[PDB]
Point group: C2
Chain length 138, copies 2
């Protein structure tokens, strides 16, 4: 059956991260948002939890990675069209994000990337509906 | 208006794996299906729900997506992927299965009563949680419980 997804990312400053993602147009769930965690809503079925580093450290026995030095994970969100890809990525860069990789452009697929305020690597990507193919058993 | 909610996006979490076939089989045992259109020898598209996916990408290929060296998830943690569970028994079945299939313990089980979760590191050291929360906690938030 479908499960909900919560992607937990450590951040130095919850308030700054919440403002960054708000600028990108994400809503937050107030019931799961406080000084140490902000619950970014991506859809009904997926959320990104922006967790203060000191709280995040309770969840792992390993030191917290420096995402400006190494990459363990990349979060990609879909976009509705090419203009959404550019608006989202340009907004991220203007809000303090930094360049990651060159745009990927196949004409009918278009993606951009950036590192967020804490170095976590994001992609935003559109694929043509004529191109975008279901779940099958392994 | 249902348009009070902003336009949703699909979510994909890209993770580097040493062996795509071994990773696909591991998550298949946990009950996940895969989308064939986006699955091949270099990348397996795990379907968590209609709107969330995990791309298990061969580690050599994953290097194309970042200018940084790839992390050793057995040494450091950058992210945790948590998936929901329908009830407490689902938490236990999922975590027990993961542990019996080559997963390793990450943290003790966390039982808050209104919320119950277990965690493990997968075959590549990425840290996962499976977690059930009561309807009351989902509406009210943990703070009020
Ligand atoms: K901090
Ligand atoms: Na720790």
């Amino acid at each position: 059956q479908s499960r909900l997804t919560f992607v937990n990312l450590p951040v130095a400053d919850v308030a700054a991260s919440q403002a960054f993602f708000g600028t990108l147009g994400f809503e937050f769930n107030p019931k799961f948002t406080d000084e140490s965690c902000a619950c970014m809503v991506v859809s009904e079925q997926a959320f990104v939890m922006l967790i203060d580093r000191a709280r995040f450290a309770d969840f792992t026995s390993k030191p917290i990675a420096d995402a400006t030095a190494t990459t363990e994970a990349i979060v990609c969100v879909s976009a509705i069209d090419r203009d959404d890809v550019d608006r989202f990525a340009d907004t991220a860069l203007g809000a303090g994000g930094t360049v990651a990789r060159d745009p990927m452009d196949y004409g009918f697929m278009y993606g951009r990337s950036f590192h967020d305020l804490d170095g976590h690597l994001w992609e935003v990507m559109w694929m043509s509906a004529e191109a975008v193919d279901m779940a099958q058993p392994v």
